[PDB]
Structure formats: C-alpha cells, structure tokens
Amino acid sequence: ASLARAVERLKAALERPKDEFIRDSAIQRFEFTFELAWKTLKTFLELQGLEARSPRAAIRGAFQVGLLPEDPFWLEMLELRNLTNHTYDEALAERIYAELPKALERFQELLRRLE
Amino acid sequence: ASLARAVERLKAALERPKDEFIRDSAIQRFEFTFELAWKTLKTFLELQGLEARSPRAAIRGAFQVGLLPEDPFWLEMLELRNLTNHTYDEALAERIYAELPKALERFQELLRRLE
Incomplete structure (x- = not known):
C-alpha cells in the first residue's frame, strides 16, 4: 500500500x-487515497506514543503533533468521503468532484511533510 | 433516488x-448502486411487515420472503462492496471488476422481481 502511488x-x-x-473514477480514487492517508497518519502518530482510533482523531493528532498545518479543510474532506x-x-x-483538486493539494502536502 | 436508474x-x-x-468508475457505480439496492430491499421488507437493519439481514430477509431466489452470490457482493x-x-x-458483469445480472433480476 503506497501513498505516493495512490496520489499519482x-x-x-x-x-x-x-x-x-x-x-x-476520480471520486473512487479519492476514497482509497483517503484510506491510505489516514492510516498513514495513524502509524506515524502511534510511532511516537499517541493513538488514533479513527480518521478524525488521526487528523486532530497530526494537527497538534505538528506534521500537518492547521487546515479546517481536512475535516471537510472527511465529510465528503462519507458521501461517496x-x-x-x-x-x-x-459537488464532490468540485473539491477533489484541493483535496489533491492536501495529499501532496502530507507526502512532502512525511519527508 | 432510482434503483432502476443507478443500475443503468x-x-x-x-x-x-x-x-x-x-x-x-464501474467500481464506484457499484459502490452506490449496491447501496440503493439494499435500501430498496429494506423498504420492501418493511412494507412486507418484517424488519431488516443491516445489509446482510436485508439479503437474508429477501431470500426468506421469497423475493429473490436462493443465491450465495449476493453475500459475495456484500463482501466485495466492503472492499471498495x-x-x-x-x-x-x-478482482472486483471481474465480478461486476455477474453482479449486474443480479441487480437487473432484483429490479425485474420488484414488479
């Protein structure tokens, strides 16, 4: 499961x-990318003690523990993802495809910050 | 929302x-066409005076009331539906795609029987 490739x-x-x-197909790909995304955050967070038992928590976790910069949009994505x-x-x-281009920017950002 | 339309x-x-x-995109149209399908059985069951809370319960109920004929493939779909x-x-x-043509035969069957 490669995040870099899901983004691609x-x-x-x-x-x-x-x-x-x-x-x-875009919407479809948006979902599995999001699955790998939050799981990524999870693993990362768990690595250093913290625990994320759900996507929102993984978002919230990364926000505090630094990693991702304060972006209320992530929570907005999470919401769209439940509608797929x-x-x-x-x-x-x-209405969903209209936000994917931005969602893509966030994923590309996470890939960067994960060094 | 129309099932007949989602099947189309x-x-x-x-x-x-x-x-x-x-x-x-076929996977994604399966993800939702299936969601309408179980919500359509649920409705039908409810009208029949029965109760179905979950997708499986709804499928098992479908078989019992004699709407759909005994077919273990419906459970395979649900198992697939959860892997999207x-x-x-x-x-x-x-692996999913390969099974879609069969799944479509079954949706079309359900549609035909709700008649």
Missing part, C-alpha cells in the same frame, strides 16, 4: 478532460 | 471498452 492515480484522473466516467457511497445522486457527485 | 449507470460503464478510468476502500491495491480492483 488520483492526480491522473483529475487531469483528464471531465465526463461522467472520469468523474466517478451516496453518489447515486448525480448532483452530489458533482 | 452501472450497465453503461460496463458496456464501454475497458481501461483504468472506466474500471475504477481497499482498492489502492490494483490487483484487488481487477
């Missing part, structure tokens, strides 16, 4: 010229 | 010639 796959879909297929399974609603699909 | 969205992605983006988030692993995505 998300970026990929995000550069293509949008249509419903590339859209959904309700995208049978095409408007919600669009 | 899956069919579409399945007819198009394959590649990564289409692959991933572990798609950062491409060997898995391919």
Whole structure:
C-alpha cells in the first residue's frame, strides 16, 4: 500500500478532460487515497506514543503533533468521503468532484511533510 | 433516488471498452448502486411487515420472503462492496471488476422481481 502511488492515480484522473466516467473514477480514487492517508497518519502518530482510533482523531493528532498545518479543510474532506457511497445522486457527485483538486493539494502536502 | 436508474449507470460503464478510468468508475457505480439496492430491499421488507437493519439481514430477509431466489452470490457482493476502500491495491480492483458483469445480472433480476 503506497501513498505516493495512490496520489499519482488520483492526480491522473483529475487531469483528464471531465465526463461522467472520469468523474466517478476520480471520486473512487479519492476514497482509497483517503484510506491510505489516514492510516498513514495513524502509524506515524502511534510511532511516537499517541493513538488514533479513527480518521478524525488521526487528523486532530497530526494537527497538534505538528506534521500537518492547521487546515479546517481536512475535516471537510472527511465529510465528503462519507458521501461517496451516496453518489447515486448525480448532483452530489458533482459537488464532490468540485473539491477533489484541493483535496489533491492536501495529499501532496502530507507526502512532502512525511519527508 | 432510482434503483432502476443507478443500475443503468452501472450497465453503461460496463458496456464501454475497458481501461483504468472506466474500471475504477464501474467500481464506484457499484459502490452506490449496491447501496440503493439494499435500501430498496429494506423498504420492501418493511412494507412486507418484517424488519431488516443491516445489509446482510436485508439479503437474508429477501431470500426468506421469497423475493429473490436462493443465491450465495449476493453475500459475495456484500463482501466485495466492503472492499471498495481497499482498492489502492490494483490487483484487488481487477478482482472486483471481474465480478461486476455477474453482479449486474443480479441487480437487473432484483429490479425485474420488484414488479
């Protein structure tokens, strides 16, 4: 499970010229990237004593323990991520794809900070 | 939200010639088309005067009331449905995709029977 590669796959879909297929595939890739992301934070945090038993906690953890800089947007992403399974609603699909480009910026940031 | 419509969205992605983006989008259209499917059984069961709290309970209930015929593949789908988030692993995505054409036959069947 490589984070650097999951990002590469998300970026990929995000550069293509949008249509419903590339859209959904972007959303799809957004989810598994987020899974590897928070697990990353987890492992990192646990390494130094702290404990994260859930994504939000891993976000909150990284925020205090330095790592990621105070960005209320991460919590915003977490919220979108819970909707991916309700995208049978095409408007919600669009509403989500609209924020992926930013979400990508955050992931690219985490990759950097993890040195 | 229409199940019949969500099924049509899956069919579409399945007819198009394959590649990564289409692959991933078919997975994502499965992630939600399945969510509507169990929420549709739940509703049906409720109207039947029964109770179903979870996806499995709903599928088991479907078999009991005689809506759907005995088919162990429905549980395999649920097992697949819960792996979408572990798609950062491409060997898995391919494993899921391969089973989608079968899953579509079953969704179309459910739709046909709710008639």
